[PDB]
Design a protein around this ligand. Structure first.
Ligand SMILES: CCCCCCCCCCCCCC(=O)OC[C@H](COP(=O)(O)OCC(O)COP(=O)(O)OC[C@@H](COC(=O)CCCCCCCCCCCCC)OC(=O)CCCCCCCCCCCCC)OC(=O)CCCCCCCCCCCCC
Ligand code: 07D
Ligand code: 07D
Ligand code: 07D
Ligand SMILES: CC[C@H]1c2cc3[nH]c4c(c3C)C(=O)[C@H](C(=O)OC)c4c3nc(cc4[nH]c(cc(n2)[C@@H]1C)c(C(C)=O)c4C)[C@@H](C)[C@@H]3CCC(=O)OC/C=C(\C)CCC[C@H](C)CCC[C@H](C)CCCC(C)C
Ligand SMILES: CC[C@H]1c2cc3[nH]c4c(c3C)C(=O)[C@H](C(=O)OC)c4c3nc(cc4[nH]c(cc(n2)[C@@H]1C)c(C(C)=O)c4C)[C@@H](C)[C@@H]3CCC(=O)OC/C=C(\C)CCC[C@H](C)CCC[C@H](C)CCCC(C)C
Ligand SMILES: COC1=C(OC)C(=O)C(C/C=C(\C)CC/C=C(\C)CC/C=C(\C)CC/C=C(\C)CC/C=C(\C)CC/C=C(\C)CC/C=C(\C)CC/C=C(\C)CC/C=C(\C)CCC=C(C)C)=C(C)C1=O
Ligand SMILES: COC1=C(OC)C(=O)C(C/C=C(\C)CC/C=C(\C)CC/C=C(\C)CC/C=C(\C)CC/C=C(\C)CC/C=C(\C)CC/C=C(\C)CC/C=C(\C)CC/C=C(\C)CCC=C(C)C)=C(C)C1=O
Ligand SMILES: CCCCCCCC/C=C/CCCCCCCC(=O)O[C@H](COC(=O)CCCCCCCCCCCCCCC)COP(=O)(O)OC[C@@H](O)CO
Ligand SMILES: COC(C)(C)C/C=C/C(C)=C/C=C/C(C)=C/C=C/C(C)=C/C=C\C=C(C)\C=C\C=C(C)\C=C\C=C(C)\C=C\CC(C)(C)OC
Ligand SMILES: [Cl-]
Ligand SMILES: [Fe+3]
Lengths: 257, 305, 274, 46, 44, 47, 47, 44, 46, 46, 43, 46, 47, 44, 44
């Protein structure tokens, strides 16, 4: 029956469906442009020169830089076209572009693989009030652990093999998100040395009365090499990245190093 | 086992606070509370809520609609509380029959449904203005209101816009638990199996894709949560190793990746397109395609019967 | 080619099996041993699907359909032309999906991230395995599996639902639906909030966690926060799948009647069974 | 028995009691409206 | 709660529960007189 | 038995008990209203 | 066996035990109401 | 919990179970007299 | 065999047993109620 | 020829090969059970 | 260590031989009951 | 003697026990699906 | 043979074994109840 | 787990499994006497 | 894996594959005698 027809065979529902397919293809192009605001252009794996297999859609592939305005009055561009140095403290196992790298030295201190981090700003994340967000409870007297929970302070810090790394001496809290981000651990060896421990790299074990912070990521010997921070009461985004990357590398490297 | 970051073991407390907005006619209502179990999943603060003129309007219109429905349901069991509970899921308020067109039917013959539907519609559209204006008050983008507009477009298509195209309310949706399910069943059968409606197929693909994306994205951010990945807007404005490793996991897995910002555009568009393509599939049904299986046979979805 | 930050992460190690032999990349893709076995099962199963299309009556993509054996075969292996093809494709698909999950584990190991993604994908695999293995085994015939075809799997859904009079009345199916709708709602809200904070509008500075929490406190009186929403969004999607699996293990293996008639227990409760 | 007001806050007590009594009263009037004998608005005969 | 405070509450509780049971027992008696609820062999 | 008020707070006990006994009583009256014999408001005969 | 109270908190134990025994009792009365023979409110004949 | 306190609770608990089982046994006896629940060979 | 209580926590053993044994007992009573021969409440003939 | 076992690790090879040979063997026995002539358990006449 | 593995081998080689022995006896009993290779006429 | 120098003896036991149980369970269920070898139904050799 | 308890934890071994054996026992009793010959609750004749 | 602890566990385990198999063996014997589970050529 | 270990492995492996193929070849011969698997023009 003639109701929907546009031609002998063509009809409105079919036309509306192809109009959707045209829209959806255009949307995928838009979405893929947004996906390319970090990391692009692509580079040759060996030389690091800007190269990749590209069609004529290359001309629409990467968007003009959008500018984010930060409440400090600084800005961030995306794409910024900044890229990592071509040289790293590792070498390929075979000369082909697809080959993996082997670390030249200690990968955890050389910051390669899961020990690698981004060169974030040497600035702390800020509260809406402009104060640094992540600070020890020593400096945030209005914060407290909820009365229902175990306070980590004074607990021993223990690795997966049962060696004591130290004791918890402070909590670093995020004033903006209202959460514990790090524990500040005084080391058992070189007593008086303090290191940050990412709180999500821990759990509290309380099956036995002398409850303890267990750390699966790294062994007790690795705590002495945890990256240091420049200030005693604030931490930059770069220092956060450096510390968190170090512990994330433990699952691959801690039985090597 | 390492910490999987599914529940917050130790959670902190502080004085409740919130971002400033300009003074209105109504302050933020309620004393902020805290609950321990919400603090395990997420933030503990059962904070104050903003009212405002648009909030008053939406709740008043919506309350009247809910009362008109609820009173009609209880009247349909002759006010018995026992039969109300016994029959609750089966109770419904029905639209008018087709002979009334789009004019006001008698109250008992779907006039109450028309009033309830109008008041519910108005309340929802006022809630859209609320979702919009709360973003502008916070100097935030209006993305949430425009996502909500797609859900509303399906709701309006079901309840009013297709009736307007059909010239009567008889195939509009009844207010009732099993009744609106029965409407969904009968609508598919009357128009020749909704599986053959390609816009229902699209709507399903985006419904499945939404659960796919949230499973992928939720698992991704938790996988990088020991690297600070849950701090997404900070990662958007200063790319950390968490955003780098999230990108590389997907690139190495499937050959391509998003950014920390653009994955939220993929999320936004998939959920929007579920209801948008849904609404189009409803508006084409009976207006230009009377039997979707027969349309499918014409366009090669099935062999000729 | 590589992303501007990729090279420093492309280190050796993290493989579950096979050692160094497979530990390399083909363009953007990581290989590994489970990459190879992914390709093995993928090519086999795909070519067998195309073979089934060549055997069947049409090349119209929508109409192509590889069907399980007749229920009369029970759980025996059928002849290739009589449903055995569907059986080989099914177990090749299992091999492919399991290989894909284990390959993701190797990528997680290399990047030092948690295993949440392959774990979450394991619920997709379990849902597929429930429909093509567990349910038909408990029902005693491979012929209860869904056919591999663009429209014919939707026909199987239709036939299977109406076998129980009206599938909307399955209580686990109602809960599965609720969680799927809630997942799409939560995804719409989550995508919108991050974009509204990152894109406040021209002449406005990027907003942070306090604004993000304040928007949902102002609108709906609660905020789950930036970590909680990813926990919730994951749990919602996985729970929707779990209840979908339950709704199908109920329908046929356990409960065989009309789902509308199941609800009559409610009307018979003694405090209102007048 | 007056010591119950040392045990419980009168403000909470009266709000709870007023809510309870209203909902109970409304329930009973709805029950009666559903009967044949006691629906005063329909007024069936005895 | 002290020992004496417990013993004092127990006094008021004990009278209250006995009054509650006393009214309830009288209500059950009146209902039984109206219509008993244990059926004989022939039913009701 | 007075020592049970050393185990339990009287404030909590009474609120819980009041809630329990009301719900129990409401359940029993609704059960009786579902019977033919004991629905007093409809008053079927004892044939 | 008084050593049970050195294993288990009597307060928690009594709350759990009372909750269990109520739910069990309530189940058994609802089971009997479902039978012909033991539904005292309907009172079928012992034919 | 100290031994004397555990023994004090056990004394009252022991008394309470005896009352509870005593009342329940009396209830079951009356129900058995009304309608017994172990059927003979021909059933009920 | 008392060494088993150094191996397993007695408090978990009792809570585990009580849970297991109740669920098992309840299962068996419901299985018997599903039979003509042993459903004592219906009391069919032999 | 033994240099192959320095180029391919015997731990990896024998696990992969045993897994491969089992899956292939299992496939072939199920194919034979699919047939009339070679289903030794059903044992139809020739 | 190799001697520690060598005494594992002693336990392994003995434990498989009883396992295969019990299985062989089970197969012999099943064959005596009902053989599982059909003749030309079938079973 | 030497295969334990190549493979972890714990992994050998765990894998082999799981493999042998699943294989045994499969074969018993296969036999139950036959007429001739289902011992619990015990069809005749007609 | 006792060296197996150096290789495998006594606690997990007994728990895993008891779990395995209970599931296997339930499986066999339910299989027998599915048969006519061995369902002791139904008790069919050996015709 | 020490050598002595392992050997002590092995002693208790060996006795327990032997008892468990002994009870099960008697259970199978009683079931076999009631209804054997190996059919003859003509079935059961 | 040292050169003496690789030569040790190659000897054991080469014997093992020949035993595996030898058993398989005898199994195939037994099956062929029982029921051959190449049909004639008129089938089986
Ligand atoms: C053997 C088994 C094979 C199973 C089927 C597999 C299908 C997919 C093919 C997978 C293999 C592709 C390999 C490849 O392209 O490598 C390029 C790379 C050299 O490249 P390069 O130098 O590094 O430069 C590349 C770069 O410039 C390209 O730009 P960019 O980096 O921004 O993006 C990367 C691409 C990569 O894409 C892929 O690899 C495939 C993506 C997945 C396609 C899946 C299609 C089917 C699903 C439905 C589609 C739906 C589309 C709409 O990223 C993309 O293109 C991503 C596009 C994403 C669009 C998402 C849309 C979602 C919508 C969902 C549906 C909603 C419905 C309502 O190669 C080399 O280095 C040399 C060595 C390898 C040569 C490869 C030769 C060809 C292999 C073909 C394999 C056999 C295929 C049958
Ligand atoms: C339209 C202007 C211009 C034009 C010359 C051009 C033409 C073609 N492109 Mg393209 N494209 C252009 C621009 C551009 N392009 C892409 C991408 C991709 C990827 C994945 C996206 C996909 O799902 O596409 C969806 C469709 C979209 C985006 C529209 C262009 C493609 C069409 C109409 C071809 C569709 C027909 C097929 C038989 C299927 C092709 C294969 C797959 C999708 C796997 C995929 C392989 C692809 C295929 C092709 C083909 C076969 C052609 C032919 C026939 O000429 N294009 C995106 C990407 O990530 O690239 C790595 C992306 O960013 C981007 C940009 C900006
Ligand atoms: C026999 C049944 C038959 C069968 C063939 C089949 C089967 C399946 N289908 Mg379908 N369906 C059938 C019929 C049919 N199907 C749909 C729709 C869909 C979409 C909904 C998207 C959405 O988000 O909805 C949900 C969103 C809505 C409805 C819009 C947002 C809601 C709003 C604004 C309301 C706000 C609420 C308040 C303020 C509260 C007020 C209070 C009170 C009133 C008391 C979704 C993708 C989808 C999924 C699947 C699957 C997975 C299957 C499987 C596996 O079989 N189906 C709707 C539509 O869009 O159709 C194009 C629609 O109308 C319609 C019909 C009539
Ligand atoms: C007449 C039909 C009748 C009607 C009344 C009705 C209606 C509705 N229902 Mg329904 N339904 C009916 C029958 C019926 N219903 C379901 C199911 C559902 C679920 C589906 C999602 C899910 O399960 O995802 C389970 C997810 C799986 C199975 C995951 C599969 C994917 C995997 C492993 C990965 C695959 C990857 C590749 C192959 C790679 C390819 C290559 C490249 C991309 C390069 C969901 C909750 C649901 C929704 C609704 C709605 C919204 C409606 C509306 C609006 O009316 N229904 C199915 C299920 O539970 O399955 C476990 C099931 O089988 C079944 C039946 C037979
Ligand atoms: C993109 C598609 C998905 C989507 C998106 C979506 N939904 C949304 C949004 C978005 C982006 C919102 O912004 C909005 C929201 O607020 O989310 C938190 C909303 C929303 N989605 C909703 C529901 C919903 N969404 C659904 C689905 C979907 N939503 C899709 C999957 C579904 C279903 C069936 O799948 C439902 C049911 C709501 C929770 C919410 C919109 C709320 C709204 O409009 O409320 C209007 C007001 C009322 C109903 C009245 C309430 C009255 C009270 C009882 C008053 C009591 C107090 C008062 C003071 C008394 C006064 C008495 C006097 C007058 C006498
Ligand atoms: C469990 C929650 C949700 C979920 C999660 C999820 N899915 C995932 C992941 C996660 C977390 C991944 O990491 C993984 C991924 O890589 O995502 C990009 C994946 C994935 N989810 C996918 C799809 C998908 N997920 C779905 C659903 C869901 N996925 C759930 C809603 C659906 C539905 C409902 O329809 C689909 C189609 C893929 C994009 C991807 C897995 C890719 C993969 O396994 O690749 C290797 C295999 C191949 C390339 C092809 C193998 C071909 C086979 C040999 C034959 C298959 C034939 C088939 C049986 C029949 C087809 C006919 C149809 C018409 C029925
Ligand atoms: C924090 O925010 C996050 C981001 O980041 C910042 C993200 O990005 C994402 C990710 C999300 C998005 C980017 C959004 C878009 C995604 C979706 C909408 C989801 C749906 C996805 C798709 C539609 C894409 C589907 C594509 C898939 C599954 C990939 C298909 C590809 C293959 C099967 C090939 C795999 C390759 C392998 C195994 C190895 C390499 C091989 C080849 C390149 C080709 C074949 C091989 C050869 C040519 C040679 C080698 C072959 C061998 C050795 C074998 C030979 C033998 C044979 C038999 C073949 C998320 C979640 C996120 O939260
Ligand atoms: C960057 O990070 C971000 C955050 O932080 C900064 C965030 O915070 C959020 C925001 C997200 C959340 C706060 C939580 C999201 C969680 C979910 C979607 C899953 C669970 C569901 C909800 C929390 C409900 C969502 C809806 C809400 C809160 C209502 C919004 C509307 C109003 C307040 C006004 C109108 C509606 C009202 C008054 C009530 C609506 C009804 C319900 C909520 C359901 C009530 C239940 C029933 C009617 C019963 C149904 C069931 C029945 C009958 C049978 C079973 C019985 C039961 C009792 C269930 C996001 C997205 C985010 O990106
Ligand atoms: C001219 C004379 C010859 C001399 C030159 C010869 C040599 C050069 C040839 C190169 C072409 C082949 C490589 C193709 C990949 C090259 C890279 C690529 O993506 O190209 C696009 C086509 O991709 C692709 O089709 C990739 C396709 C991959 C998947 C193919 C599957 C085929 C099999 C299943 C089919 C049925 C499925 C079922 C259908 C229902 C086209 O560009 P386009 O700008 O958009 O790129 C996006 C980018 O530019 C954005 O930055
Ligand atoms: C007071 O105490 C309480 C709250 C307990 C009272 C009781 C309340 C209860 C129990 C309420 C129960 C409500 C239920 C069970 C509701 C179920 C609702 C469902 C499932 C609804 C599902 C879908 C409905 C849809 C999509 C309907 C849409 C209708 C629309 C959009 C209609 C619009 C109509 C218009 C605009 C009419 C225009 C015509 C005019 C009025 C202009 O001229 C006639
Ligand atoms: Cl956890
Ligand atoms: Fe996010």
């Amino acid at each position: 029956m003639n109701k929907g027809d546009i031609t002998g065979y063509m009809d409105v529902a079919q036309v509306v469906l192809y109009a959707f397919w045209i829209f959806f293809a255009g949307l995928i192009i838009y979405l893929r442009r947004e996906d390319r605001r970090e990391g692009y252009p692509l580079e040759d794996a060996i030389s690091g020169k800007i190269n990749s297999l590209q069609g004529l859609g290359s001309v629409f592939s990467i968007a003009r830089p959008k500018i984010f305005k930060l409440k400090t009055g600084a800005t961030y561009a995306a794409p910024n076209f900044k890229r990592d140095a071509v040289a790293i403290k590792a070498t390929r196992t075979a000369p082909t572009a697809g080959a993996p790298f082997e670390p030249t030295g200690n990968p955890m201190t050389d910051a390669v693989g899961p020990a690698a981090y981004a060169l974030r700003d040497e600035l702390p994340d800020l509260t809406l009030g402009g104060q640094p967000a992540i600070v020890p409870l020593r400096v945030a007297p209005t914060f407290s652990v909820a009365a229902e929970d175990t306070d980590p302070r004074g607990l021993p810090v223990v690795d997966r093999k049962g060696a004591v790394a130290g004791k918890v001496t402070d909590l670093w809290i995020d004033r903006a998100s209202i959460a514990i981000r790090y524990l500040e651990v005084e080391l058992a060896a070189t007593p008086g040395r303090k290191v940050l421990l990412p709180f999500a790299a821990t759990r509290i074990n309380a099956k036995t009365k002398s409850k303890t912070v267990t750390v699966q990521s790294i062994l007790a010997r690795h705590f002495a090499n945890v990256p240091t921070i420049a200030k005693t009461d604030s931490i930059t985004r770069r220092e956060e990245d450096k510390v968190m990357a170090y512990y994330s590398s433990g699952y691959l490297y801690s039985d090597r190093v | 086992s390492e910490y999987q970051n599914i529940l917050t073991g130790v959670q902190v407390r502080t004085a409740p606070h919130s971002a400033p907005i300009a003074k209105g006619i109504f302050p933020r209502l309620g004393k902020p509370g805290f609950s321990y179990w919400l603090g395990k999943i997420g933030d503990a603060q059962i904070g104050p809520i903003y009212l405002g003129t648009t909030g008053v309007l939406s709740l008043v219109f919506g309350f009247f609609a809910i009362e008109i429905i609820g009173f009609n349901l209880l009247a349909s069991v002759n006010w018995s509380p026992m039969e109300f509970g016994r029959q609750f899921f089966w109770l419904g308020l029905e639209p008018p029959a087709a002979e009334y067109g789009l004019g006001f039917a008698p109250l008992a013959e779907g006039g109450w449904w028309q009033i309830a539907g109008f008041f519910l519609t108005t309340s929802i559209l006022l809630w859209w203005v609320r979702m919009y204006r709360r973003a502008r008050a916070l100097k935030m983008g209006t993305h949430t209101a425009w996502a909500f507009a797609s859900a509303i477009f399906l709701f309006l298509s079901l309840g009013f816009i297709r009736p307007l195209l059909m010239g009567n309310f008889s195939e509009s949706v009844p207010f009732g638990i099993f009744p609106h399910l029965e409407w969904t069943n009968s609508f598919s059968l009357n128009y020749g199996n909704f599986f053959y409606n390609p816009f229902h197929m699209l709507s399903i693909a985006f419904l499945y894709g939404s659960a796919l994306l949230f499973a992928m994205h939720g698992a991704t951010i938790l996988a990088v949560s020991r690297l600070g990945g849950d701090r997404e807007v900070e990662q958007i404005t200063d790319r950390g190793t968490a955003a780098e490793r999230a990108a590389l996991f997907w690139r190495w897995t499937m050959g391509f990746n998003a950014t920390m910002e653009s994955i939220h555009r993929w999320a936004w568009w998939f959920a929007v397109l579920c209801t948008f393509t849904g609404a189009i599939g409803i508006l084409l049904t009976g207006t230009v395609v009377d039997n979707w299986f027969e349309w499918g046979v014409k366009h090669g979805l099935a062999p000729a019967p | 080619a590589l992303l501007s930050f990729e090279r420093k992460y492309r280190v050796r190690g993290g493989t579950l099996i096979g050692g160094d032999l497979f530990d390399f990349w083909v363009g953007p893709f990581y290989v590994g041993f489970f990459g190879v076995t992914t390709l093995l099962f993928t090519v086999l199963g795909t070519a067998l699907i195309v073979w089934g299309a060549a055997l069947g009556p049409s090349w119209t993509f929508w109409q192509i359909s590889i069907n399980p054996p007749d229920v009369s075969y029970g759980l025996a292996m059928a002849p290739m032309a009589k449903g055995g093809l569907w059986q080989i494709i099914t177990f090749s698909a299992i091999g492919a999906f399991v290989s894909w999950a284990l390959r993701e584990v190797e990528i997680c190991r290399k990047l030092g991230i948690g295993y949440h993604i392959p774990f979450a994908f394991g619920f997709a695999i379990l849902a597929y395995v429930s429909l093509v293995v567990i349910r038909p085994v408990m029902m005693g015939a491979w012929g209860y599996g869904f056919p591999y075809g663009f429209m014919t799997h939707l026909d199987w859904v239709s036939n299977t639902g109406y076998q129980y009079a009206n599938f909307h009345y399955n209580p686990a199916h109602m809960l599965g639906i609720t969680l799927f709708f809630t997942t799409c709602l939560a995804l719409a809200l989550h995508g919108s909030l991050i974009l509204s904070a990152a894109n406040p509008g021209k002449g406005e500075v990027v907003k942070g966690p306090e604004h993000e929490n304040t928007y949902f406190q102002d609108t709906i009186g609660y905020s789950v926060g930036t970590l909680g929403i990813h926990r919730v969004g994951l749990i919602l999607a996985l729970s929707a799948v779990v209840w979908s699996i339950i709704c199908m293990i109920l329908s046929g293996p356990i409960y065989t009647g009309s789902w509308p008639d199941w609800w009559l227990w409610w009307q018979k409760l003694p405090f209102w069974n007048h | 028995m007056w010591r119950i007001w040392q045990l419980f806050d009168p403000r909470q007590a009266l709000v709870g009691l007023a809510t309870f009594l209203f909902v109970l009263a409304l329930l009973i009037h709805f029950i009666l409206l559903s009967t044949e004998r006691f629906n005063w608005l329909e007024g069936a005969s005895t | 709660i002290t020992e004496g405070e417990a013993k004092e509450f127990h006094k008021i509780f004990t009278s209250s529960i006995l009054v509650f049971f006393g009214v309830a027992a009288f209500a059950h008696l009146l209902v039984w007189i109206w219509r008993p609820w244990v059926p004989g062999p022939n039913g009701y």
